[PDB]
């Protein structure tokens, strides 16, 4: 979440979707929303290569409990991350996602 | 062998047919000048179902381009792949029938249908083993709806045993592109119920939703919509054409999705639909294709299948894939959505698998659905038709062309019988 | 001398025949062009030179699969006139394959089969490979079997049929075709070795470690079964078993003739390395309910006849000890009117591994054909699906408008009910 500008728009577009239960959620729909955010925010001016790996994954309730980004990496660069950094980032990304919706709720009440 | 005669009627039909022949020539490696420039032998193994070999090994599409106005003929001829069709297969008139079903079915449709019937008879007598016909048109249009209807009726009474399947663009729910759309649509559907084996109902608004939400197209033009419809047509007749692990022609699909003669209206679909941005984040697997094709957002008609029950479905897969994965995905789909499938038909899915995927893809699949949610589309058409007919709006045109109010009453009664049958089943 | 003709009908039959004839060519050393760089006589014929033409016909109503055969690696093995094909398939319709499209081809097929029979000296019988839930695999198979019974009213007619699976299914009208085929061929067949795609999928996943098998692996396993069945005709062994032996030892009553096929040493290379597969082990694997290639639990019924066909480094004493162990088991129960329910065949030729296959090279193998009352449950499921679809009268117009009558539907359903009653009667103990 070090970008901030991109995650702001991404939390405004997933609001109408994640409120529904997880059973009606299918991954093929959210990708069009993520792709829309990367185009509108400042993340468009970015290396096309790294943007090819950034996608969504569905953890396996409510839509605010199974959504998370993945950024899969394979090849030579995969010897630095080694399937454990990707099992640690997602362990972190939840705590930064919760502490981000608990704030945009409290600026909506305000 | 298993030759198909393709007829394009009206503006919508002609444009969709032009895109269809573009994608078919791409599949079979045919140059826009008609020459084969492909790489594999399977492209010429079954070129005969769609093409006729001319003198200098040039392949002429077995297509008849019929319209009541010359503008579309000129546009098709002048554009790319326009020097592909036989110049004797452009059968057009001068007055464009307006947006009048009666004009295209009774006054100008008569002369033009005699001419196009002569052309179609020549094309059929040239064929070795005729599999059937396919028509591209729009029900809400003028020459398209009425003339496609008249041609369908006459070809049906000439060739009753052949498979007549149409890819018809139905009126949209929200915004109409023609004021008299319900009249033309109702009359066309009344005629399509009895003289067609497979009607693939396509709505432009569902296509707009697909382009905007799934393909993330900022400015989707009619080219993209026609490309989607052409991909569906491709998939079906590709199951017919190329070798596969589980073959299925037009007649096999007709047998497996038409439980009763009048219940032959389908919602088409296409599984591998991805935006250019998301093509790198998505895994192309049979489960992904199945999940997308059975999604209510992907279906190409604005009829939610969750409001009805699938009588039958057909999945035409393309590419090298494992039959076990296909069958297990089909079983999982049937088990999870047991409430969305008819109980008195066990195994509501017909599976076909072809070995050759479309150009640029590794896997693909088309979804055909005989569901009781088409009753919603026919209900909308019926409400609009009765709303205009009760106060007799825009009716003097149809009456003056030579029709009668009794024909309108019969058409609406037949469409109400159709919705009654769908609701009953 | 003991020549036998194999007939492959439909896509399933033709592809299984592809696998079977690949296996036969590998076993007998015949190159895919018919030349060799006797044993190869019950299935091949010699034409002057080293050319060995297989004694089979490949008949389909669709040019696609047969054309794949005509242009494949075995393009020059089969006689071009024995690869019979139509123009339009039966479209999963029994009526099309039996009445409308099958009548335009049956004469050519019978002429070719007559040529093959005349070329033979002593005809043991026919091997019909087909699928139950296909158009030409049902209608044309039934038509061909009835015509063969009219012509060769004494030769045995064994058919290898792909029984529809309990859950997985590729067609919607499979119950109709299956019931009608069962009617027509049950009138005119000797014994039908049955197999399921779902069961072979489960076998592949559990034993061969394959998570994504195709029809190719299924066809290879089925071809191994057929090779084990015909090894006695093709090779020399301690206990030879002919086709008439199968017919006599596996069919107690004329209608109850649907045994289930099994193959014990289905194992990958590494697992085969770590195991010591012996006669007792392979026999126990054969009688394991999870290794059945028809998805029917044998514990739900009673065995009436078993045909254990061993091959390779097999000792008769070990076979006897293993069979005695099986008989002493309490989970495996036999009908009370068959105190001796084991036909045993032993062959000296170990199974041949196909290059590119998944089965590991083993020293011995066994194929078990078991006639059991557990198939009655599968019949009950099939007729239940038929009853639902026919009560709604779905798809019936497709069959009726193609040379059939609804009376045939009712008669076929009544015949299947009689077959279920017969299975129930033979199941019960004598008092």
From Swiss-Prot, chain A:
Tissue: Ubiquitously expressed.
Superkingdom of source: Eukaryota
Compartmental location: Cytoplasm, Cytoskeleton, Microtubule organizing center, Centrosome
Annotated family: Belongs to the TUBGCP family.
Binding partners and assembly: Component of the gamma-tubulin ring complex (gTuRC) consisting of TUBGCP2, TUBGCP3, TUBGCP4, TUBGCP5 and TUBGCP6 and gamma-tubulin TUBG1 or TUBG2. TUBGCP2, TUBGCP3, TUBGCP4, TUBGCP5 and TUBGCP6 assemble in a 5:5:2:1:1 stoichiometry; each is associated with a gamma-tubulin, thereby arranging 14 gamma-tubulins in a helical manner. Gamma-tubulin at the first position is blocked by TUBGCP3 at the last position, allowing 13 protafilaments to grow into a microtubule.
Its job: Component of the gamma-tubulin ring complex (gTuRC) which mediates microtubule nucleation. The gTuRC regulates the minus-end nucleation of alpha-beta tubulin heterodimers that grow into microtubule protafilaments, a critical step in centrosome duplication and spindle formation.
The protein, known as: Gamma-tubulin complex component 3
Provenance organism: Homo sapiens (Human)
Curated annotation (Swiss-Prot), chain B:
Family according to the record: Belongs to the tubulin family.
Binding site for Mg(2+): 69
Disorder named in the UniProt entry: Fibrosis of extraocular muscles, congenital, 3A: A congenital ocular motility disorder marked by restrictive ophthalmoplegia affecting extraocular muscles innervated by the oculomotor and/or trochlear nerves. It is clinically characterized by anchoring of the eyes in downward gaze, ptosis, and backward tilt of the head. Congenital fibrosis of extraocular muscles type 3 presents as a non-progressive, autosomal dominant disorder with variable expression.
Cofactor requirement: Mg(2+)
Protein name: Tubulin beta-3 chain
Reported effect, residue 302 to V: In CDCBM1; does not form tubulin heterodimers
Annotated consequence of substituting residue 417 to H: In CFEOM3A; severe phenotype with congenital facial weakness, congenital wrist and finger contractures
Keyword Magnesium (UniProt): yes
Keywords of the record: Cell projection, Cytoplasm, Cytoskeleton, Disease variant, GTP-binding, Intellectual disability, Isopeptide bond, Magnesium, Metal-binding, Microtubule, Nucleotide-binding, Phosphoprotein
A Gene Ontology biological process term: axon guidance
Residues that bind GDP: 10-12, 15, 99, 138, 142-144, 177, 204, 222, 226
Function of the protein: Tubulin is the major constituent of microtubules, protein filaments consisting of alpha- and beta-tubulin heterodimers. Microtubules grow by the addition of GTP-tubulin dimers to the microtubule end, where a stabilizing cap forms. Below the cap, alpha-beta tubulin heterodimers are in GDP-bound state, owing to GTPase activity of alpha-tubulin. TUBB3 plays a critical role in proper axon guidance and maintenance.
Disulfide bond sites: none
Motif MREI motif: chain residues: 1-4
Effect after changing residue 262 to H: In CFEOM3A; severe phenotype with congenital facial weakness, congenital wrist and finger contractures; affects microtubules polymerization and depolymerization rates
Result of altering residue 380 to C: In CFEOM3A; affects heterodimers formation; results in increased stability and reduced dynamics of microtubules
Residue list for modification Phosphoserine: 172
One family name in Pfam for this protein: Tubulin
UniProtKB/Swiss-Prot annotation, chain C:
Positions where 3'-nitrotyrosine occurs in the chain: 273
Swiss-Prot/TrEMBL induction comment: Autoregulated by feedback control of mRNA degradation. In excess of soluble tubulin, TTC5/STRAP cofactor triggers cotranslation degradation of tubulin mRNA.
EC number: 3.6.5.-
Active site positions: 245
Cofactor(s) essential for the protein: Mg(2+)
Location of Omega-N-methylarginine modifications: 330
Record text about domains: The MREC motif mediates interaction with TTC5/STRAP and may be critical for tubulin autoregulation.
Purpose: Tubulin is the major constituent of microtubules, protein filaments consisting of alpha- and beta-tubulin heterodimers. Microtubules grow by the addition of GTP-tubulin dimers to the microtubule end, where a stabilizing cap forms. Below the cap, tubulin dimers are in GDP-bound state, owing to GTPase activity of alpha-tubulin.
Protein name (record): Tubulin alpha-1B chain
């Amino acid at each position: 979440l070090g970008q901030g500008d991109f995650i702001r728009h991404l939390m405004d577009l997933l609001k109408p979707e994640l409120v529904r239960p997880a059973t009606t959620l299918y991954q093929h729909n959210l990708t069009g929303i993520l792709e829309t955010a990367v185009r509108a925010t400042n993340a468009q001016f970015d290396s096309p290569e790294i943007l090819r790996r950034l996608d969504v994954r569905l953890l396996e309730d409510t839509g605010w409990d199974v959504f998370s980004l993945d950024y899969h990496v394979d090849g030579p660069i995969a010897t630095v991350f080694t399937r454990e950094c990707m099992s640690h980032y997602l362990r972190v990304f939840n705590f930064l996602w919760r502490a981000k919706r608990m704030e945009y709720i409290l600026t909506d009440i305000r | 062998m298993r030759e198909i005669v393709h007829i394009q009627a009206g503006q919508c039909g002609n444009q969709i047919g032009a895109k269809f022949w573009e994608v078919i020539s791409d599949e079979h490696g045919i140059d826009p000048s008609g020459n084969y420039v492909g790489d594999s032998d399977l492209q010429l193994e079954r070129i005969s179902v769609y093409y006729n070999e001319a003198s200098s090994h040039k392949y002429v599409p077995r297509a008849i381009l019929v319209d009541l106005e010359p503008g579309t003929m000129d546009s098709v001829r002048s554009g790319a792949f326009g020097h592909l069709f036989r110049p004797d297969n452009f059968i057009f008139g001068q007055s464009g029938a307006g947006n009048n079903w009666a004009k295209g079915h009774y006054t100008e449709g008569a002369e033009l249908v005699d001419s196009v019937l002569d052309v179609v008879r020549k094309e059929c007598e040239n064929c070795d083993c005729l599999q059937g016909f396919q028509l591209t048109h729009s029900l809400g249009g003028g020459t398209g709806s009425g003339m496609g209807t008249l041609l369908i009726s006459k070809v049906r009474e000439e060739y009753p045993d052949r498979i007549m399947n149409t890819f018809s663009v139905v009126p949209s729910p929200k915004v109409s592109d023609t004021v008299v759309e319900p009249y033309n649509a109702t009359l066309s559907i009344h005629q399509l119920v009895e003289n067609t084996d497979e009607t693939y109902c396509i709505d432009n608004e569902a296509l707009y939703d697909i382009c905007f939400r799934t393909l993330k197209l900022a400015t989707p033009t009619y080219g993209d919509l026609n490309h989607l419809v052409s991909a569906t047509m491709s998939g079906v007749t590709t199951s017919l054409r190329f070798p596969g692990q589980l073959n299925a022609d037009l007649r096999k699909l007709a047998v497996n999705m038409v439980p009763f003669p009048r219940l032959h209206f389908f919602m088409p679909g296409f599984a591998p639909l991805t935006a250019r941005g998301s093509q790198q984040y998505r895994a192309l697997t049979v489960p992904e294709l199945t999940q997308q094709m059975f999604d209510a957002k992907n279906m190409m008609a604005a009829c939610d299948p969750r409001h009805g029950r699938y009588l039958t479905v057909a999945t035409v897969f393309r590419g090298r894939m494992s039959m076990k994965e296909v069958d297990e995905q089909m079983l999982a789909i049937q088990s999870k959505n047991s409430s969305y499938f008819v109980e008195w038909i066990p195994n509501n899915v017909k599976v076909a698998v072809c070995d050759i995927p479309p150009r640029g893809l590794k896997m693909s699949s088309t979804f055909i659905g005989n569901s009781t949610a088409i009753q919603e589309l026919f209900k909308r058409i019926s409400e609009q038709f009765t709303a205009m007919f009760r106060r007799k709006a825009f009716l003097h045109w149809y009456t003056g062309e030579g029709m009668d109010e009794m024909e309108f009453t019969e058409a609406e009664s037949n469409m109400n019988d159709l919705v009654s049958e769908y609701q009953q089943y | 001398m003991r020549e036998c003709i194999s007939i492959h009908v439909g896509q399933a039959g033709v592809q299984i025949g592809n696998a079977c004839w690949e296996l036969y060519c590998l076993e007998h050393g015949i190159q895919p062009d018919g030349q060799m760089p006797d044993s190869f006589n019950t299935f091949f014929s010699e034409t002057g030179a080293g050319k060995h033409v297989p004694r089979a016909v490949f008949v389909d109503l669709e040019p696609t699969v047969i054309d794949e055969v005509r242009t494949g690696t075995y393009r020059q093995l089969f006689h071009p006139e024995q690869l019979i094909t139509g123009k339009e398939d039966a479209a999963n319709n029994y009526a099309r394959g039996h009445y409308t499209i099958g009548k335009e081809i049956i004469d050519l097929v019978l002429d070719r089969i007559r040529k093959l029979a005349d070329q033979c000296t002593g005809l043991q019988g026919f091997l019909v490979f087909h699928s139950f839930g296909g158009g030409t695999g049902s209608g044309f198979t039934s038509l061909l079997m009835e015509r063969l019974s009219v012509d060769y009213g004494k030769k045995s007619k064994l058919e290898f049929s792909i029984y529809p699976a309990p859950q997985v299914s590729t067609a919607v009208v499979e119950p109709y075709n299956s019931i009608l085929t069962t009617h027509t061929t049950l009138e005119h067949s000797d014994c039908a070795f049955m197999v399921d795609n779902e069961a072979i999928y489960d076998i592949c996943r559990r034993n061969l470690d394959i998570e994504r098998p195709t029809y190719t692996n299924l066809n290879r396993l089925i071809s191994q079964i057929v090779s084990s069945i015909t090894a006695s005709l093709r090779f020399d062994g301690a206990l030879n078993v002919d086709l008439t032996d199968f017919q006599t030892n596996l069919v107690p009553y004329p209608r109850i003739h649907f045994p289930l096929a099994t193959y014990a040493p289905v194992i990958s290379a590494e697992k085969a390395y770590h195991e010591q597969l012996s006669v007792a082990e392979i026999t126990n694997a054969c009688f394991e309910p999870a290794n059945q290639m028809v998805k029917c639990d044998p514990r739900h019924g009673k065995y009436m006849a078993c045909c254990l066909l061993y091959r390779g480094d097999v000792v008769p004493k070990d076979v006897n000890a293993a069979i005695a162990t099986i008989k002493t088991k309490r989970s495996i129960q036999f009908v009370d009117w068959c105190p001796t329910g084991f036909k045993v065949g032993i062959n000296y030729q170990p199974p041949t591994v196909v290059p590119g296959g998944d089965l590991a090279k083993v020293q011995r193998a066994v194929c078990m054909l078991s006639n059991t009352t557990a198939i009655a449950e599968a019949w009950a499921r099939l007729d239940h699906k038929f009853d639902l679809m026919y009560a709604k009268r779905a798809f019936v117009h497709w069959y009726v408008g193609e040379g059939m009558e609804e009376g045939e539907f009712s008669e076929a359903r009544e015949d299947m009910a009689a077959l279920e009653k017969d299975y129930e009667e033979v199941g019960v103990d004598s008092v």
